[PDB]
Swiss-Prot record, chain B:
Keywords: Cell shape, Cell wall biogenesis/degradation, Isomerase, Peptidoglycan synthesis. Disulfide bonds: none annotated. It catalyses: L-glutamate = D-glutamate. GO terms for molecular function: glutamate racemase activity. It comes from Listeria monocytogenes serovar 1/2a (strain ATCC BAA-679 / EGD-e). The active site is at residues 73, 184. This is Glutamate racemase. It is an enzyme of class 5 (isomerase).
Length: 266, 265
């Protein structure tokens, strides 16, 4: 009768959300699916992204999940409303939780948003933020290089420092006191970004609030488990299981995990 | 008439510690607040009576057209949350679960102290919630019956408050507890004194912030967030309006507040 929390993503970035779920909800089993054969999603057409997101959704629903996290900013924007309406389990994305966390952390209502070209172009974060607080001013900044620096493992190195300083220089001209990491890969750069931005700026890992919302929703529906003793996490990918496993076992401190290859769509 | 309020119910001024954070995180939402000052304390009351009173406050605010309810009182949450959630057609949340999440996020060694009322402690709601989230947590609870009295009397910044806090909390210093949950919504009014007493190795937690984020999340989830530009909060007490205003205006920074007296019985 034990059921997983499902996570869907285009790749490995959603693992940063899983990381916070492991901390905050240690009794819950996680089923994660990264569609690495077809990432990036950012460049793709909304219809296509919804179709892909439904394929991933349907796969995890067949596997038995009691809640779904769309742990991808692009998929969250393209499909959240339709999936939430059609499924009878709770479904959330990462954008409303990140926005909430920013509104909690800000003191001057000047917020920065870092993300992919697609994310920043969507205006999803400004729309969420401003709907909650009309006084907020939001500066959005595309950071095209960051995903590569993280996936390639360079995110602690001298390269990351230079890439962060280069990319975020515009933000230094502002009085922003809060920066939302609006791409699930970006938490791996968080210490470097905090260093560049300085001690007056709160840097938001939206996985932390997302995990809290999962916990709250599970409680709200009386679905929280009491033990981790028969926990069997499962990781699924459409791309290379080895490349995925190599990253995941490091980010999640899980040397013994198993990654299942799957075939979706076409 | 198009905006509807979020309702908050409490034994007295404690619920204001949740309201403060709602005003911050949800600045366009209207608050309707009811404190049952005339029957405070709820702490030493039997669970059946706490539930009865909590239902009285609920009915009052439901009749005023609230769109969501926050039980901003820990003993009431323990007594009545599930029954009120189950019977109402509007979302209802309590304050024990958010406090429990917040404490577990702050702890470094998994050793948590809970301060609360006699009723909250007897219920074991906090240890049950905490261990339900992380079975490796170690929880110790302490009943602090004088704390509510000092807060409701407007004496929470005084020499007497400092003595009472020192008297009650001294046993926590003989432990390795690194996190203390303020498990009565009145207790944040005493937080500077408690922080100074406990010292800097101990995270003292006001769960109002975590409660307000949950209110925000549930409104969004159910498509209940206010999208209008209407500009008027309403406070109700079963005791003296002046004494309530003196405390509320200190805690909230809201010089022009509307406070009215009501009868529940
Ligand atoms: Ca109204
Ligand atoms: Ca231990
Ligand atoms: Cl008591
Ligand atoms: Cl209480």
């Amino acid at each position: 009768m034990k059921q997983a929390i499902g996570f869907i993503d285009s790749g490995v970035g959603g693992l940063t959300v899983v990381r916070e779920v492991l901390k905050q909800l240690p009794h819950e089993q996680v089923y994660y699916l990264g569609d690495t054969a077809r990432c990036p999603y950012g460049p793709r057409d909304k219809e296509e992204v919804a179709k892909f997101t439904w394929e991933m959704t349907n796969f995890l629903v067949d596997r038995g999940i009691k809640m779904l996290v769309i742990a991808c900013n692009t998929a969250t924007a393209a499909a959240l409303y339709d999936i939430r309406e059609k499924l009878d389990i709770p479904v959330i994305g990462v954008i409303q939780p990140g926005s909430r966390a920013a509104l909690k952390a800000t003191r001057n209502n000047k917020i920065g948003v870092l993300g992919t070209l697609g994310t920043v172009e969507s205006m999803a974060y400004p729309t969420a933020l401003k709907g909650l607080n009309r006084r907020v001013e939001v500066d959005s900044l595309a950071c095209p290089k960051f995903v590569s620096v993280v996936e390639s493992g360079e995110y602690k190195s001298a390269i990351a420092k230079k890439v962060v300083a280069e990319s975020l220089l515009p933000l230094k001209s502002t009085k922003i006191d809060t920066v939302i990491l609006g791409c699930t890969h970006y938490p791996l750069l968080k210490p470097i970004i905090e260093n560049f931005m300085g001690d007056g700026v709160a840097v938001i890992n939206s996985g932390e609030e997302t995990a809290s919302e999962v916990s709250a929703l599970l409680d709200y529906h009386n679905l929280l488990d009491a033990t981790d003793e028969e926990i069997e996490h499962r990781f699924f990918t459409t791309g290379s299981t080895q490349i995925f496993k190599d990253i995941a076992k490091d980010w999640l401190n899980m040397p013994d995990m198993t990654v299942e290859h799957i075939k979706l769509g076409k």
